[PDB]
Amino acid sequence: MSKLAIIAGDGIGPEVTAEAVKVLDAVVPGVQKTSYDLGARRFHATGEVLPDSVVAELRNHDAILLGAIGDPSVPSGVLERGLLLRLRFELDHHINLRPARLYPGVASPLSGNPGIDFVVVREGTEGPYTGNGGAIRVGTPNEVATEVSVNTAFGVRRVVADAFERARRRRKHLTLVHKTNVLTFAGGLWLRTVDEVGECYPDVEVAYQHVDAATIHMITDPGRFDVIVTDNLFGDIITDLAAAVCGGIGLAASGNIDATRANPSMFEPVHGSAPDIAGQGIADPTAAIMSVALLLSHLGEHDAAARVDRAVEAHLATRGSERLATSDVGERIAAAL
Amino acid sequence: MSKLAIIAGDGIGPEVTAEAVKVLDAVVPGVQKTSYDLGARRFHATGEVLPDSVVAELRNHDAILLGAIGDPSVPSGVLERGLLLRLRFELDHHINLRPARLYPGVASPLSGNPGIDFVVVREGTEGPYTGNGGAIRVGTPNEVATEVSVNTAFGVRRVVADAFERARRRRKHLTLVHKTNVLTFAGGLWLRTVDEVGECYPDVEVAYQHVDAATIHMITDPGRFDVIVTDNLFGDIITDLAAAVCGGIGLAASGNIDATRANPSMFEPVHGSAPDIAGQGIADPTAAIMSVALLLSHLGEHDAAARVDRAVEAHLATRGSERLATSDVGERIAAAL
């Protein structure tokens, strides 16, 4: 590891992040941690969302651990577009890594406890999630609104390369998910890029599914997936579907990765700030701790990451339906390290 | 009176349509039926996909019943674009109606057989699945590919108006599903339109969900939906998810509706032509028959539609696990009318 920027953020972010940090401290001692109040606290204190110079400080660290951002006290989208999206674009988090594993101790909403262990690699910096478009004649029967998705060989190849790498390290199956029959230009780019990068991974079996079909298979046959690669919009949907079939976004972790390592990558539990339960010591820190494993793995701390993975699995396997405070979960996971 | 165009189409289409037509005639005797030979068959014999002359003939009908279209022997996208999409566009099928009900007797891939009874109303004739965009520098690291989604007040309000009418006739709950935080222009148009049309429906409770959150809810809490309204792209994903949790696409029907009634609306089973089981009398005609119920209800034949619904439900509740031939299901349903 070495230098960690911590953005515990809002709501339940601080309490879960505290546990995640405790776990990180217990598996890799001697980490320099810099804590940032970014999100609602900083926004109320200073009016600042993601000050240019904050991005600059964040670059000084090996990685970022984020809790959650969002509070009903801050005006709509201010933090989401100005903090979270911006960080992702500024730090070139082109890889959104979203593992979906159904652990012993976690109920799936699917019938009959299938083994599920896949990872979604979602393109994170292009497509229509970027804000490109416009409207005319707004608020009239004549309104026309356009949304433009920009896709690039540059963006796509990076994410595809990363997904193949991950497939190679896993069960050597990659599923491209897109909608090539109807998004013919973006889909054509995705397909060809998968094929082309595929030439370097003859050991990786490649499948293609339309996103609607993939959605079905996530529900009926989620064990068919090893690594899924997809674009920003479809990945947004299917990573949430993945989390749901694996017991929910409350047990999902996310990596926002600059594979070039030029910028620090960021890791966070998928869940939001849940302001309604903020600071009650109710929130489950499991996902935030799981995001620490992701962070460790990204940084090459494979044994440390393995330790956290094991400790998480241990906690999920015996928690049963016990009401456990946030610090109790952290204690349980820490004890299994 | 009632004039019906029948596009039995390819593969299993003929067989299931025969049963659908058997059920039609049993409930509404006076139906002028014209058969149309469109799909792989026509394409091979004549080279024609959807001549303008044929569309004109189809316009002379009160509704269109379609089996299934497409075959491995036809080049990719040629029937989907030149027949199916073209029919959708030319006949102004701006509403795609996709009921999702889990029937007694049908296994859901979800745990604990949850109550599921919703309808998705999906915008049909705009958005990105129209073909809009392009690419430059293809096949190089400089490739840039764009996809453009055009959304209009004209198109959106039609779909939204229809959704509200459906929610009023149902459980008076409408969920708009979009992604307004990042598709800001199309999103704002959908939000504002639902709000504005909603003014005429104070009886309808309106909820909004991002598509990612809605897909989580389709699997964890599908009972929360009554009517869903969404755009073409998102509807394409969620209708497939909906079919899956309701026991599969093999049991889903679809309405492609011009709600102004200027053109005939079209009704079909959601399933494809399944050429591998064609003419074998294996194909389950249930969905084709459910599509007839939608057709009839669209045409104002509410009693006849109710009779079909009851007969289909009776069939699904008592079929059990025994392998039924096509005409068997057909007769099982027809007898229960």
Short mmCIF file of C-alpha atoms in Angstrom, two decimals, chain B residues 178-327:
data_model
loop_
_atom_site.label_atom_id
_atom_site.label_comp_id
_atom_site.label_asym_id
_atom_site.label_seq_id
_atom_site.Cartn_x
_atom_site.Cartn_y
_atom_site.Cartn_z
CA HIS B 178 -35.33 6.36 -16.63
CA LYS B 179 -31.92 7.70 -15.65
CA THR B 180 -32.56 11.32 -15.14
CA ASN B 181 -29.46 12.15 -13.16
CA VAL B 182 -27.20 11.51 -16.10
CA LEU B 183 -29.46 11.48 -19.16
CA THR B 184 -30.41 14.97 -18.15
CA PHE B 185 -32.11 16.14 -21.36
CA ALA B 186 -34.09 13.01 -22.21
CA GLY B 187 -34.61 12.45 -18.45
CA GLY B 188 -35.90 15.97 -17.75
CA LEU B 189 -38.26 15.54 -20.71
CA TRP B 190 -39.59 12.25 -19.38
CA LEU B 191 -39.86 13.62 -15.80
CA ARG B 192 -41.66 16.75 -16.86
CA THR B 193 -43.95 14.89 -19.18
CA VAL B 194 -44.97 12.36 -16.54
CA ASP B 195 -45.56 15.24 -14.13
CA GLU B 196 -47.60 17.21 -16.64
CA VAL B 197 -49.71 14.29 -17.83
CA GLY B 198 -50.07 13.20 -14.20
CA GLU B 199 -52.06 16.35 -13.53
CA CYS B 200 -55.01 14.67 -15.25
CA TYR B 201 -54.53 11.54 -13.15
CA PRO B 202 -54.64 12.51 -9.45
CA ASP B 203 -55.97 8.99 -8.87
CA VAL B 204 -52.59 7.66 -10.07
CA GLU B 205 -49.68 7.49 -7.63
CA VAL B 206 -46.47 8.21 -9.46
CA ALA B 207 -43.07 6.96 -8.54
CA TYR B 208 -39.75 7.47 -10.23
CA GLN B 209 -36.90 4.98 -10.36
CA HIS B 210 -33.58 4.97 -12.08
CA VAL B 211 -33.40 1.98 -14.35
CA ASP B 212 -30.63 0.38 -12.25
CA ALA B 213 -32.73 0.64 -9.15
CA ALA B 214 -35.81 -0.57 -11.02
CA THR B 215 -34.00 -3.70 -12.21
CA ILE B 216 -32.95 -4.44 -8.60
CA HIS B 217 -36.59 -4.08 -7.62
CA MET B 218 -37.77 -6.31 -10.46
CA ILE B 219 -35.92 -9.12 -8.77
CA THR B 220 -36.21 -8.25 -5.10
CA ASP B 221 -39.57 -6.55 -4.97
CA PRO B 222 -41.44 -7.08 -8.25
CA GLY B 223 -44.76 -6.75 -6.52
CA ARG B 224 -44.05 -3.00 -6.20
CA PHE B 225 -44.85 -2.40 -9.84
CA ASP B 226 -48.20 -1.83 -11.41
CA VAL B 227 -47.58 0.13 -14.59
CA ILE B 228 -44.03 0.95 -15.63
CA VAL B 229 -43.44 3.57 -18.26
CA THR B 230 -40.08 3.92 -19.83
CA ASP B 231 -38.28 4.75 -23.03
CA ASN B 232 -37.32 2.46 -25.80
CA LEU B 233 -33.81 1.50 -24.75
CA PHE B 234 -34.56 0.97 -21.08
CA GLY B 235 -37.86 -0.70 -21.87
CA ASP B 236 -36.01 -3.09 -24.08
CA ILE B 237 -34.03 -4.27 -21.06
CA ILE B 238 -36.70 -4.20 -18.46
CA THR B 239 -39.35 -6.01 -20.50
CA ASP B 240 -36.98 -8.92 -20.92
CA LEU B 241 -36.14 -8.91 -17.22
CA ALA B 242 -39.89 -8.76 -16.50
CA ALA B 243 -40.60 -11.75 -18.71
CA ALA B 244 -37.82 -13.68 -16.99
CA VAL B 245 -39.08 -13.15 -13.47
CA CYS B 246 -42.57 -14.05 -14.78
CA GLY B 247 -41.33 -17.43 -15.93
CA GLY B 248 -39.69 -16.54 -19.21
CA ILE B 249 -40.11 -14.95 -22.57
CA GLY B 250 -41.84 -18.14 -23.71
CA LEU B 251 -44.85 -16.94 -21.75
CA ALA B 252 -44.79 -13.29 -22.66
CA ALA B 253 -47.00 -11.42 -25.10
CA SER B 254 -46.40 -8.03 -26.71
CA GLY B 255 -48.53 -5.25 -28.08
CA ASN B 256 -47.16 -2.81 -30.56
CA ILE B 257 -49.67 -0.07 -30.48
CA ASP B 258 -50.56 3.05 -32.33
CA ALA B 259 -52.71 4.50 -29.59
CA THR B 260 -54.30 7.03 -32.00
CA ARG B 261 -55.70 4.01 -33.89
CA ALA B 262 -54.77 5.56 -37.25
CA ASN B 263 -52.82 2.37 -37.97
CA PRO B 264 -53.50 -1.20 -36.91
CA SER B 265 -51.68 -2.25 -33.81
CA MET B 266 -49.78 -5.45 -33.78
CA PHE B 267 -49.74 -8.24 -31.23
CA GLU B 268 -47.39 -11.15 -30.95
CA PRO B 269 -45.76 -13.58 -28.59
CA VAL B 270 -42.44 -12.18 -27.44
CA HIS B 271 -40.61 -15.38 -28.32
CA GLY B 272 -38.72 -15.78 -31.59
CA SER B 273 -39.32 -18.23 -34.46
CA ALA B 274 -37.37 -21.04 -32.71
CA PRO B 275 -36.64 -22.71 -36.05
CA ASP B 276 -35.18 -25.83 -34.41
CA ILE B 277 -38.62 -26.93 -33.16
CA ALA B 278 -40.63 -25.67 -36.15
CA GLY B 279 -43.63 -27.64 -37.41
CA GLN B 280 -42.98 -30.26 -34.73
CA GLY B 281 -45.99 -29.17 -32.73
CA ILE B 282 -43.82 -28.81 -29.64
CA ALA B 283 -44.03 -25.02 -29.47
CA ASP B 284 -46.13 -23.69 -26.60
CA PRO B 285 -48.87 -21.49 -28.18
CA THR B 286 -49.78 -19.96 -24.82
CA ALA B 287 -47.95 -16.69 -25.51
CA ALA B 288 -49.41 -16.38 -29.00
CA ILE B 289 -52.84 -16.83 -27.40
CA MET B 290 -52.09 -14.25 -24.69
CA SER B 291 -51.16 -11.89 -27.52
CA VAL B 292 -54.67 -12.44 -28.95
CA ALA B 293 -56.13 -11.40 -25.57
CA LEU B 294 -54.09 -8.18 -25.79
CA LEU B 295 -55.27 -7.70 -29.39
CA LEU B 296 -58.86 -8.19 -28.43
CA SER B 297 -58.66 -5.85 -25.44
CA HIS B 298 -57.02 -3.19 -27.61
CA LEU B 299 -59.91 -3.60 -30.08
CA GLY B 300 -62.53 -3.00 -27.41
CA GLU B 301 -63.52 -6.70 -27.13
CA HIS B 302 -63.14 -6.69 -23.38
CA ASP B 303 -65.38 -9.64 -22.70
CA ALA B 304 -63.73 -11.76 -25.36
CA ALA B 305 -60.31 -10.80 -23.93
CA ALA B 306 -61.40 -11.71 -20.38
CA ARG B 307 -62.52 -15.13 -21.61
CA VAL B 308 -59.10 -15.67 -23.22
CA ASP B 309 -57.33 -14.55 -20.04
CA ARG B 310 -59.35 -16.94 -17.90
CA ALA B 311 -58.70 -19.81 -20.35
CA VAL B 312 -54.99 -19.17 -20.45
CA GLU B 313 -54.82 -18.89 -16.65
CA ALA B 314 -56.80 -22.15 -16.26
CA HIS B 315 -54.35 -23.78 -18.67
CA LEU B 316 -51.25 -22.52 -16.81
CA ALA B 317 -52.69 -23.56 -13.42
CA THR B 318 -53.48 -27.15 -14.50
CA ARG B 319 -50.86 -28.05 -17.15
CA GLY B 320 -48.51 -29.37 -14.48
CA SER B 321 -45.36 -30.88 -15.94
CA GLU B 322 -46.72 -33.17 -18.69
CA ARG B 323 -45.38 -32.50 -22.22
CA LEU B 324 -48.23 -31.00 -24.27
CA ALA B 325 -48.32 -30.68 -28.05
CA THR B 326 -49.28 -27.31 -29.57
CA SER B 327 -52.84 -28.17 -30.56
#
